[PDB]
Design a protein around this ligand. Structure first.
Ligand SMILES: O=C(O)c1ccc2c(c1)ncn2C1CCCCC1
Length: 301
């Protein structure tokens, strides 16, 4: 009926705003990115600081893991993405081509491709092995806020401040659907690929049916009018939607009923990012400059 997330650890180390937190697919690590130009790696279970990964020339908006947990990609205001070997901390490739800040990034499940979105209004698809751009999609008419591959890698969903979410065939780059306009600040496919979760800067999350192009559920009660705040499908226990919020709380909703089931109190600034652990009922959350911490929470269900 309700989870009971409780605070387990508070982590500190970044020196400017955190932008993203992500658990590795193998469950071992949490990665964080920051405006301080750094990626930090932390133990997923006890929060133990592991390493700092450095090389970008300006702040980082997003980081994402390869499926085997060995690689990270980061998206930076320096107009590049970087592919990193996590074990060595070394930059393997610098992905050059965007003409403005890179805001979002993700590997496909196969992890042979990366997708990126930029302030330059394009979505790019990159070959991981060569580090070269394969396609540039003229995807949007305003900054691209999120990019995500579906469960088998065959489709990409993008979102933009232009108010649109677009679905693309990965192999051909063709736009198969546009969901119709408040700025869309985040989007991702549901685990089964049939639905799309989208955040808009009007304090609203929406669950869309891809095949019907129609909104099925809305989730409200939180505050989101300014920042790029991701939303997650929590699937290890009860089926929830999880999101940060501009009122310093983590919100958790019942996916089916849309009711709020928990609000996590503890942060002292906007909760800018949350992530859900792949096997345990564990949430990571990060707050802005008045707070400066990442918090790890645990629920029994
Ligand atoms: O695993 C998934 O991707 C997934 C996606 C939507 C799911 C689900 C699982 N279980 C129930 N739903 C509802 C949510 C509200 C309407 C759509 C059906």
């Amino acid at each position: 009926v309700k989870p009971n997330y409780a605070l387990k650890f508070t982590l500190a180390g970044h020196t400017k705003a955190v932008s993203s937190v992500k658990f590795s697919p193998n469950g071992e690590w949490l990665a964080s990115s920051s405006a301080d130009k750094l990626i930090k790696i932390w133990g997923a279970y006890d929060g133990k600081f592991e390493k700092t990964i450095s090389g970008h020339k300006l702040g980082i908006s997003d980081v994402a893991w390869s499926s085997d947990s060995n690689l990270l990609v980061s998206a930076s205001d320096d107009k590049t993405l970087k592919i990193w070997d996590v074990s060595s901390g070394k930059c393997l490739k610098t992905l050059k081509g965007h003409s403005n800040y890179v805001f979002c990034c993700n590997f496909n499940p196969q992890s042979n491709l990366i997708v990126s979105g930029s302030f330059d209004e394009s979505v790019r698809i990159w070959d991981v092995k060569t580090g070269k751009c394969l396609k540039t999609l003229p995807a949007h008419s305003d900054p691209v806020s999120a990019v995500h591959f579906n469960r088998d890698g065959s489709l990409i969903v993008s979102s933009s401040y232009d108010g649109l979410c677009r679905i693309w065939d990965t192999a051909s780059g063709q736009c198969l659907k546009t969901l119709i306009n408040p700025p869309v600040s985040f989007v991702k496919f549901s685990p089964n690929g049939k639905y799309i979760l989208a955040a808009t800067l009007d304090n609203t999350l929406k669950l869309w049916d891809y095949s019907k192009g129609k909104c099925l559920k809305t989730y409200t009660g939180h505050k989101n009018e300014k920042y790029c705040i991701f939303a997650n499908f929590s699937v290890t226990g009860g089926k929830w939607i999880v999101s940060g919020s501009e009122d310093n709380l983590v919100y958790i909703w019942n996916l089916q009923t849309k009711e709020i089931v928990q609000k996590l109190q503890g942060h002292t600034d906007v909760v800018i990012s949350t992530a859900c652990h792949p096997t345990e009922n564990i949430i990571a959350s990060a707050a802005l400059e008045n707070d400066k911490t990442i918090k790890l929470w645990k629920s029994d269900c």
